[PDB]
């Protein structure tokens, strides 16, 4: 059965079904609560190259959605738009009532292509995609989400500015996926798994101030050197 | 009790919720937009509540996933009602001895 957390004397315990605990008291349904917690609070990798490898594609399982009433402020959120090589769409459209996560600090908008096996994108570890008060088990197209888990509790008897970072992915869903951080419609930077979002913003600002933007009709891809870490090469 | 087996723990829970509790703000026509109905809070102090609560969240996910698989609901909204009904049934669900250890009635 679903475990239920009881808060007593500022301590958390698991309710015991067989043993009837008399001191536990429930006066009204207001005390019952469900709260969603992000996975980043457990100290897990949050960069796109490491984040996108926890999701897989499958077919033959219908998606399910369950609500939650409270959440935690999220520093990293993701927004996916993936196309098949012929041009079709992989991720299903967002059903009515589903909206993006309300409180995000950085939103990693990733758009790219991939083989797109299966029909739906599930979480390989069994977690949920939180969305807005509606945690689902699949990813919807163009909707901000954040990986998290839902817990149930009996409560004791008693600015916001976002930032969007734009990526481009080739071979999404496979073990050989290539990511590029987009600074302009023509200029890109090769992406590693060690760059914090603030470092990416600083790279953007440095590239613009240094006049490193592409001036031709072709594409320009920079590559930051590993040692100096401030001299972008090519 | 619950012991946190996660690699690391964030002890502060900076949370947002929807419940509030003026003038004409309750009317939907004059009410806030869909993005301004939330509040904020920060439970900086805890006696290990946050670190055990995260482990409880991790623990409950297997049962939650199995329950979601079993049901045919497109969207489930009634788990808390079932929990409350189960609580009431366990407390009082039949013949109840006054002095029995399975009853919450006490004499005085």
């Amino acid at each position, epitope marked *: 059965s679903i475990p239920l957390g009881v808060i007593h004397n500022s301590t958390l315990q698991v309710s015991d079904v067989d043993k009837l605990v008399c001191r536990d008291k429930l006066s009204s349904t207001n005390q019952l609560r469900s709260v969603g917690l992000n996975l*980043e609070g457990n*100290g897990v990798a949050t960069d796109v190259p490491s984040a996108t490898k926890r999701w897989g594609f499958r077919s033959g399982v219908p998606p399910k959605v369950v609500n939650y009433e409270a959440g935690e402020w999220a520093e990293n959120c993701y927004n996916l738009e993936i196309k098949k090589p012929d041009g079709s769409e992989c991720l299903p459209a967002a059903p009515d009532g589903i909206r993006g996560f309300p409180r995000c600090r950085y939103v990693h908008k990733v758009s790219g292509t991939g083989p797109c096996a299966g029909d739906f994108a599930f979480h390989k570890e069994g977690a949920f995609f939180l969305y807005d008060r509606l945690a689902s088990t699949v990813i919807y197209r163009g909707t901000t989400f954040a990986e998290g888990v839902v817990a149930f509790l009996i409560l004791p008897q008693a600015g916001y500015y976002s930032t969007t970072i734009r990526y481009q992915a080739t071979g999404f869903g496979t073990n050989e996926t290539e990511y590029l951080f987009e600074v302009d419609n023509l200029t890109y930077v090769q992406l590693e798994s*060690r760059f914090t979002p*603030q470092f990416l913003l600083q790279l953007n600002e440095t590239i613009y101030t240094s006049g490193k933007r592409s001036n031709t009709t072709g594409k320009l891809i920079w590559k930051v050197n590993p040692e100096i870490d401030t001299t972008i090469g090519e | 009790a619950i012991v946190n087996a996660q690699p*690391k723990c964030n002890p*502060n829970l900076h949370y947002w919720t929807t419940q509030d509790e003026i003038g004409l703000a309750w009317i939907p026509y004059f009410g806030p937009a869909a993005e301004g109905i939330y509040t904020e809070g920060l439970m900086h102090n805890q006696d290990g509540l946050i670190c055990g609560l995260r482990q409880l969240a991790n623990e409950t996910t297997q049962a939650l996933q199995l329950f979601l698989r079993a049901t045919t609901e497109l969207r489930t909204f009634s788990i808390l009602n079932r929990k409350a009904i189960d609580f009431l049934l366990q407390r009082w669900g039949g013949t109840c001895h006054i002095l029995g250890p399975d009853c919450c009635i006490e004499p005085h």
Partner: antibody
Amino acid sequence: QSVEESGGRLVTPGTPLTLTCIVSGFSLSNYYMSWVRQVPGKGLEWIGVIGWSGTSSYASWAKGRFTISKTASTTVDLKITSPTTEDTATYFCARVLYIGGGFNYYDAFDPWGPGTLVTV
Amino acid sequence: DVVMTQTPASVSEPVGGTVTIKCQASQSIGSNLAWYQQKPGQPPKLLIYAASTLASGVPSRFKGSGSGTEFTLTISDLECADAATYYCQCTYYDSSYVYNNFGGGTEVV
């Protein structure tokens, strides 16, 4: 990956003071930076930290006595406001280290600086 | 707030033995621990992180183990160059939660 500190000098109580820590081999935008002091012949004391997001966090016992800020692009400063005779110590400066996993978390304070000396 | 206690205040041993230092944690912190050695007049130097992983360049003689609430650090084949104070630090919380996470200090002779 090396840092160093400067600014230690003798001042009377109440005289504001500022120290400076500079780095080499890494970027301030990829790591936090912590200040740890040590009274002579005593144990280490964590003072505060400055993050790569720009915000800073202070210890409870040093909530308002110290400030930590980022000047220029590769320097940080610890400003002591109204020092007393109890703040004579060897101040240090370290970078938090994470090997894999997500950011905002650390595993050790690897590159300790030589440490400056402050006398009151 | 996890409180760390270093049990042996001071240890003395003839050259070539094995010195054991115990570091105890109030709560359960898994394997999040670090060890430092501080020579006089020098900043602390990292020896072990994650309570079992050797640092880069430190000799293999220093070896740490333990988990949960109890951790131990063993220095095998003591040399005259290993005389310093040793500290154990907890790395269980995030980098913004600042507190007194260090230890007392064990003087090895």
